[PDB]
Design a protein around this ligand. Structure first.
Ligand code: NA
Ligand code: NA
Ligand code: NA
Ligand code: NA
Ligand code: NA
Ligand code: NA
Lengths: 91, 91, 91, 91
């Protein structure tokens, strides 16, 4: 259940990082940052894709990735955080 | 169910793209990018509407579009992704 | 139900617009834009509060406003949009 | 219930503020602003981490903090706002 969504999102973040460092010429660490702030809908205030290929990629990358990247956070906050921090409140 | 929300959001993204390329003078591919990052609440870190008409349009475009654009992602992640990737885990 | 949340969010957006045009020196139409992109979590890619008073105001303005501003969109998309566009699909 | 999530998020915002003022060289009030706009997914349109350590920290800080920071807003809008403003509508 939780170990499946953990890999589905890693494959999704590794896909983004490979695309932006290649088409947009960004350093790998930067392309993983832009990819993460997008699927989480935080967004980057300094960089926006400057190629026609990047603009179209980001649009389709949002509608596909936000469903699962946000689907893992829901499982990562209710499977691991809730019970662990909850079962912690027993003195 | 899912084929209805697919067209409701396309009509909503085509509406945005036509407005920003005309009032703000943006190239069409850019206006579709700004329109997508808004309804998904990602946001663009380089461009903000520079006309009084664009500022008011974006405000009303957010409160109307975010309800359905996010209503399709919910259906696109539970109707197509969940069962397909789930039914995939059968060896 | 829906007419109550409609005024709760207007009072919340009118509060933001009055604060940023005064403390940050923004034109009123700009302060209403920055206030809307914040409570909806879209965010503005050109302006960030440049006064210590504005930085603290925005933080507390997010945790209080996002609960209701997003609580109206939920009602505005299920009370008015769902049944209207749904009852529309009857030929 | 609500007093537990109130401290879990303060510890989470105090963690962010200490990291960005130190690694990125930001003034404390600025690091608390960047930390708040991130966990709420608003995002800052002027600053993005400029060190390799900051870029990696922000990525892991998003996936851990957004689950609880958004889990408190849900409780802060349904435990305190709903009944208070609702019980207010009795003349
Ligand atoms: Na969001
Ligand atoms: Na954002
Ligand atoms: Na943003
Ligand atoms: Na700039
Ligand atoms: Na957002
Ligand atoms: Na900028």
């Amino acid at each position: 259940e939780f170990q499946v969504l953990f890999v589905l999102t890693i494959l999704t973040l590794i896909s983004g990082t490979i695309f932006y460092s290649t088409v947009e010429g960004l350093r790998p660490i930067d392309a993983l940052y832009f990819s993460v702030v997008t699927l989480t809908t935080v967004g980057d205030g300094n960089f926006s894709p400057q190629t026609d290929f990047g603009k179209i990629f980001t649009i389709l990358y949002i509608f596909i990735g936000i469903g699962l990247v946000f689907g893992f956070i829901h499982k990562l906050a209710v499977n691991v955080q809730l019970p662990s921090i909850l079962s912690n409140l027993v003195p």
